[PDB]
Amino acid sequence: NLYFQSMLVPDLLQINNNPCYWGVMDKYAAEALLEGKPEGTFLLRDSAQEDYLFSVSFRRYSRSLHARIEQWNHNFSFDAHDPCVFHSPDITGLLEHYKDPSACMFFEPLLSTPLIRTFPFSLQHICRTVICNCTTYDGIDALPIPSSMKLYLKEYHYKSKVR
Amino acid sequence: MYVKLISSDGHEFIVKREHALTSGTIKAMLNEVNFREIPSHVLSKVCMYFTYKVRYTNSSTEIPEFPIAPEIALELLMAANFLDC
Amino acid sequence: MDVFLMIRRHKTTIFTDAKESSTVFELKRIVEGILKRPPDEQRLYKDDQLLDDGKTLGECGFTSQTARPQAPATVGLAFRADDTFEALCIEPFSSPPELPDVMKP
Ligand SMILES: [Cl-]
Ligand code: NA
């Protein structure tokens, strides 16, 4: 494709029910949470970069490291354009793959002990996650709400350049 | 200690003031508040959120799901947005 | 162990909490401060079962799994009209509309 189709993250409600996910947070705030912590301690958060929805922040080699999640062909991975690298149709399955420390290679993230979110999200956000789970991206346009709200429901999408 | 939030269909919800202050709209407009555009099946649910929000703020535990049925989700989205919470 | 409740009568709902080990009577005291009717002038109900003043809320079945902040347990309430009590009556909430077709399976 020379164009792209917007598509809701398929996994969005599962992700928001996953306590390792902290929502809008920058890498400095992740680093503060992860400071000093043991190898493999991790979190999922929104990436502050414009072209990526999510990043993981995790601990390894005594450093707080980050990994943006990429997509391509409806799969997610930490390298979307290298098909040797493992990918999943889900964000959840991509985290699940990197759960086992003795089966993580040095150049791969290690996501073995989730840091647990200690506050609840907003009621507005929680409704969004439920609505998005029932509907598709094009479906959002047919809803009986203002377009300011359509804008809001459409936030967690990725750009599909394939068919 | 308590405040009364009245829905469009006349249902009266007595909730603690501290929990109602979870809404920025309500915090800004404060005994009684009338909501002529929010009906009882939605306001009852908002009240439940205020208790969830306050109880799981600085949580001692992993936080559970706030269950929302798809059937009230859109009205609840607009009331949440209108109530600023 | 806090338990979370909705006390309901006619078009009134009280959102409140109490300990699992607190008594039904103590809950009637909570209601007295709000609604201004003494304990002897109230009946509290779990579904249609009139509750025992001296029992704990946990003994009546209100617990962590049953009476959660996000999904509180309903307690019915009826007041005394003269010598006799009024019938337990709880006006239901409004009904949501049909789900939009884009939101159906
Ligand atoms: Cl968020
Ligand atoms: Na982003």
Numbering used by the authors:
A (entry chain A): 267 to 429
B (entry chain C): 17 to 46, 58 to 112
C (entry chain B): 1 to 105
What does the study report here?
Human SOCS4 was coexpressed with its binding partners ElonginB and ElonginC in E. coli. The crystal structure of the corresponding SOCS4-ElonginC-ElonginB ternary complex was solved by molecular replacement and was refined to 2.5 Å resolution. Comparison of the SOCS2 (Bullock et al., 2006) and SOCS4 ternary complexes revealed a common tripartite domain structure with an N-terminal extended SH2 subdomain (ESS helix) that stabilizes the central SH2 domain and a C-terminal SOCS box that mediates a conserved four helix bundle interaction with ElonginC. The structure of the SOCS4-ElonginC-ElonginB complex reveals a distinct SOCS structural class. A 14 residue C-terminal extension in SOCS4 prevents these interactions resulting in an alternative domain organization. Interestingly, the SOCS4 ESS helix replaces the SOCS2 C terminus in the domain interface. This is accomplished by rotation of 80° of the SH2 domain with respect to SOCS2 (calculated by using the DynDom server [Hayward and Berendsen, 1998]). Significantly, the SOCS4 hinge has an insertion of R383, which redirects the path of the main chain. The alternative conformation is stabilized by the R383 side chain, which is buried in a hydrophobic pocket between the N-termini of the SH2 domain (βA residues Y287 and W288) and SOCS box (F385 and F387). The function of the SOCS4 C terminus is then redefined to stabilizing a new interface with the N terminus, which packs as an antiparallel β sheet behind the SH2 DE loop. Interestingly, the SOCS4 substrate binding pocket is occupied by residues from the N-terminal tag sequence of a crystallographic neighbor.
